[PDB]
Amino acid sequence: SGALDVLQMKEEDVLKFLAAGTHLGGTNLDFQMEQYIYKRKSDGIYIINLKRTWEKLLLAARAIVAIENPADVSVISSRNTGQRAVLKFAAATGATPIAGRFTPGTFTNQIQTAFREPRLLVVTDPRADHQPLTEASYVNLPTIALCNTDSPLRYVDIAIPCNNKGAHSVGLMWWMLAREVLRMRGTISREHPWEVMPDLYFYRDPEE
Amino acid sequence: EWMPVTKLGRLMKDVKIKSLEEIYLFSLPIKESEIIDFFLGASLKDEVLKIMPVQKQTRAGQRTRFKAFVAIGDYNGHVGLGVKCSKEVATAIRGAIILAKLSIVPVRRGYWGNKIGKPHTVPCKVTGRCGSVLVRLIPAPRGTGIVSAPVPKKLLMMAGIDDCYTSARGCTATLGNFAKATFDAISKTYSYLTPDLWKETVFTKSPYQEFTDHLVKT
Amino acid sequence: MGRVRTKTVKKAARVIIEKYYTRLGNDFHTNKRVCEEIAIIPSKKLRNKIAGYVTHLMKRIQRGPVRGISIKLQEEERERRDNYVPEVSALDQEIIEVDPDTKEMLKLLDFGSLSNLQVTQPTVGMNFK
Amino acid sequence: MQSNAGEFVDLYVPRKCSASNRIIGAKDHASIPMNVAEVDKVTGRFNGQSKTYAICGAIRRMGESDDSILRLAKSHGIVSQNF
Amino acid sequence: RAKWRKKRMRRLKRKRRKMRQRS
Amino acid sequence: VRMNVLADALKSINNAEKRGKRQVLIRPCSKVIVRFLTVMMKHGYIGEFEIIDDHRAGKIVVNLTGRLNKCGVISPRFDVQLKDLEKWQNNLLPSRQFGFIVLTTSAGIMDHEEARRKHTGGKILGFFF
Amino acid sequence: TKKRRNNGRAKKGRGHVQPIRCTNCARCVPKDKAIKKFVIRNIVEAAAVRDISEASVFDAYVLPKLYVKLHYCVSCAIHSKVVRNRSREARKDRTPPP
Amino acid sequence: GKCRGLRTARKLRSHRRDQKWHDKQYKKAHLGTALKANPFGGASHAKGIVLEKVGVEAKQPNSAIRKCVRV
RNA sequence: CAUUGGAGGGCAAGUCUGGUGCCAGCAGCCGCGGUAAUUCCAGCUCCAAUAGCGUAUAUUAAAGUUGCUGCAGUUAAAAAG
RNA sequence: ACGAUCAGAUACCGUCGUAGUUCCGACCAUAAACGAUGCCGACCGGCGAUGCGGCGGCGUUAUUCCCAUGACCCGCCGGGCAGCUUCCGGGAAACCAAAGUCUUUGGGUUCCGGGGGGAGUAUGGUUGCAAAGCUGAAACUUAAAGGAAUUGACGGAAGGGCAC
């Protein structure tokens, strides 16, 4: 979003966007992703629009900051491929994380232990959170999600166009989304490049 | 004595919200009864419709459980239904009471064609469906009373719908889905789009957003 | 020999290996005489099986990251490992080849980067039919 | 609304959904009037004004909601980028 | 079975046809 | 043969409308369904629209709006004797607060209120809401 | 009501289809309705070709197989265990005998 | 089929008449058989002469022997 | 001294009592009488209009169970091979 | 027809076997002639696979071929042959992209059902050599016949643990 070219397209994103592999999603396409592509290979994959990607990503940041008081929004997966990323996003953001194992009824069943009252739902992927996405359609709380050319896209209100298969691309996405959201919050006045590097959000079998 | 649990009902006790409007703008899942048992304190006029037992057949004395229809109204525009299945007639009655207390649905009212006075009926010609019963509702002016079977008669007067023509394309002898259909018809008055409509609302920010002050507490 | 064990010991283990763990034994005899003081049960039948399954727990404790118990050592060590020092990886890797299709796309953005024009053009027939 | 002589047509104004130019009913669950923060565009920082989005509930199942709010944001002018 | 209900009717129809045509 | 592009308009618009597309394109057209479009505009149900010129059928693109429910087409083509007008009003269209049955007669195109105002009736072809 | 999708035969866009007859059953059914397996094997249905090789002119010969288009009727398939039933949805998905 | 043209009455009314010829509430009062075979010629009364008095059986569910007269 | 139909639900009143014991009768529908009968015959009591009440048979409405408004044809009776 | 099978087996099952199965000429007009589901017309989600023609040409491959052109190759289009999933929506459900765009009742138009039985019967006509086909009531017995789905038990239906 925005009319500030500094938040908008800069080399500061591409120098890492091309490094990860952010310009390739997957072989096939569902009929709700055509908005976010410009070219096609001769090789069987679709190369997404990273500009539209940053566009709706900044809209995602807008949604995340319209959280007037952060204590009340869930960032969720149940797959370890983004479990680390959601943990380390929530730890630094303040909104609560759920990852690995979910329990239907936490924010749907009226009577429940860990009866949590979110106010926005963040999911790593619709193919990754079947039941929580349905429950987000059940209770009036908006939904933000990554979106591949392959992926089913149902009930998605805020779309982030990128491949969500890979630790490298998804780690770039979390690691730059954190900076973008805090940027539009204003704690980051373009003073520094952020010292955390994308290897931090490429999932690890922890032996360190 | 009594305590809220869910955030919205806890606010409603925390009365900073005064009307069901700050809810039925958003169509909120109001997952606890006592919200509208705060909104009202008395005058909750009821009627215990009926008891239908339903049983499963086994090798032994087959197992039967009873369903009790009851309805709530205020002769003004508030109306609702409570349907509960229980071991006993007593528990069925109480479950119908609670479900009918939570199931309240206010209605968009109007006239038979007049533009003065106090609204008394559906705005226009509508129809409500479920089961096999399609009940077509038609308004009716002053002096025209209630034109129904007992079920639409009640569930319109108790809906504050005073004068009315009912029509049925299906079997009213099927009271259950008859009641559900004749309540869906009342429920859908906001579906039509009129020149009295067709604007853009002012987005009176969520009870949550405006009143976060208590919302971050637990 | 033996039998598959019950909830009264599943709970009695996933409480004590949670709290008493660091103070919990390493072998059966120790486990049982720990149970004598810091267990409250109406028998010795439950106590013997608690001690046997705690023997099982120490069999399972130092056995690598183990998914059948939970203890402080595990909790901290995994969190601390995740508390990590990214090696020099902002560039994410060394020199990058990319496709002319991606270059022509990034022409719209009027963008480039460290580039080598990876050529992978012709196809040999594709997804199986 | 409540007209002067009592031409009462609204008991109130239900939350209208503009993402598809269609009205909804009283008992919905996917008609979500989300808020969106406004920027200062001296640093891009959040500032105290609302860009709102309330789509009719049913379209979410079709999964057009992303596209509709794309159109809404572009029109709203907080999103200007177009390829 | 309706097949042999029909066959019974067929045979009885032949009976009545001949008993009527005879005289 | 293919028939009644008026009916086909009233089916195609309602085919696309509940699917929610902002505008619609219809292959055939006529000056008279254009005239229904204009009567629809005078109440504002639809917006402005474009008339794509291809002498073969004439295509119409028209915007759909939340000002509408549906509009019916009646073949056979009756006549309103100006006795039956109130009958048709009360038995076809859902509302006297909006929606006004349509008539082709000897005083121009019109909907039933304006028809009654000029005191001339005729054929029913349309009724909207 | 119909507890099948194409009713166990592939007549789809075409007229009445040829007959073929079971051999565990000697019953005639249309070819679309029938069940068709293609079996190949060696002569002795076990490893006796090792014995055949033990005393042989050539060491062991290239073993011309037997190829057969095995036919069953539906009911002989049931009696002789080609397949069996599937769930009220699991009939939809397929896994023929290898 | 179900056709709906305007001047169709030559098909409409005659086919409708023919398709009316199925209701009991039509047959039982629009062909001579009903009147000419009602057990009497049609009267709320049936005066006559008793010729004997007997008992009539019932079916064994409600077993009974009711008092019936041949008129 | 004013009655005519009821006293099970449907369908407006008694989980009425002596009987009688599937017995007569009631029940247009269900079933009720097969000794611990809310359907029979009587006593009180109550239900419904009322100088009325039904009985019985033609007539209508309910009806979208004639489809003109305005039917259905996979399975329900229904589409010529 | 004959051996067994079995109280009956006139049957299954085993052995022969006229008519039938075969051809040609004229009849015979039927059924689960079942997608039990008219026909013409438009539209409404996708693709995993399909068949022909017209067609855009990376890389294959073949004739001395680039340019004639076969198999390819990723595919567009047209109406064709289809499966899968999806709340598009309808119904009582199974389910069906049609059994959808139906009370928010109407693109056009041939067949046709009116509670069950009596009954495809009588009767009359008409074709048939024949058996029958088309045509088609009535008195009379009835307040139930009927479908759709859930639970019990049945199964010499199968697939799995277990009892001396």
mmCIF file of C-alpha atoms in Angstrom, chain B residues 25 193-204, chain D residues 10 13-24 52-56 72 75-76, chain F residues 22 65-67:
data_model
loop_
_atom_site.group_PDB
_atom_site.id
_atom_site.type_symbol
_atom_site.label_atom_id
_atom_site.label_comp_id
_atom_site.label_asym_id
_atom_site.label_seq_id
_atom_site.Cartn_x
_atom_site.Cartn_y
_atom_site.Cartn_z
ATOM 1 C CA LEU B 25 -24.888 -4.235 13.183
ATOM 2 C CA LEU B 193 -33.309 -3.903 -0.489
ATOM 3 C CA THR B 194 -35.406 -0.746 -0.771
ATOM 4 C CA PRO B 195 -34.959 2.909 -1.750
ATOM 5 C CA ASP B 196 -35.320 3.434 2.029
ATOM 6 C CA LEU B 197 -32.046 1.470 1.970
ATOM 7 C CA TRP B 198 -29.140 1.693 -0.507
ATOM 8 C CA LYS B 199 -26.810 3.990 1.419
ATOM 9 C CA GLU B 200 -23.493 3.424 3.154
ATOM 10 C CA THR B 201 -23.456 3.117 6.934
ATOM 11 C CA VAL B 202 -21.200 5.065 9.304
ATOM 12 C CA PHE B 203 -19.351 2.025 10.730
ATOM 13 C CA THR B 204 -19.956 2.617 14.421
ATOM 14 C CA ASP D 10 -36.229 0.966 9.381
ATOM 15 C CA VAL D 13 -29.967 0.724 9.683
ATOM 16 C CA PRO D 14 -28.358 -2.736 9.425
ATOM 17 C CA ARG D 15 -24.661 -2.786 8.605
ATOM 18 C CA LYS D 16 -24.624 -2.567 4.828
ATOM 19 C CA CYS D 17 -21.919 -4.402 2.915
ATOM 20 C CA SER D 18 -20.267 -2.320 0.193
ATOM 21 C CA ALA D 19 -17.690 -4.863 -1.001
ATOM 22 C CA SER D 20 -20.309 -6.243 -3.409
ATOM 23 C CA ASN D 21 -23.110 -3.633 -3.195
ATOM 24 C CA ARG D 22 -25.509 -5.974 -1.421
ATOM 25 C CA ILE D 23 -27.370 -5.916 1.880
ATOM 26 C CA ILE D 24 -27.190 -8.707 4.463
ATOM 27 C CA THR D 52 -13.054 -0.058 6.951
ATOM 28 C CA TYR D 53 -14.134 -3.203 5.116
ATOM 29 C CA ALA D 54 -17.414 -5.068 5.669
ATOM 30 C CA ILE D 55 -18.172 -7.634 2.976
ATOM 31 C CA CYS D 56 -21.353 -9.659 2.698
ATOM 32 C CA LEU D 72 -11.839 -1.679 -2.141
ATOM 33 C CA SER D 75 -10.382 2.597 -4.712
ATOM 34 C CA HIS D 76 -9.914 3.844 -1.132
ATOM 35 C CA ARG F 22 -20.401 -5.765 -10.921
ATOM 36 C CA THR F 65 -26.441 -2.952 -8.130
ATOM 37 C CA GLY F 66 -27.850 -3.669 -4.682
ATOM 38 C CA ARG F 67 -30.969 -1.765 -5.713
#
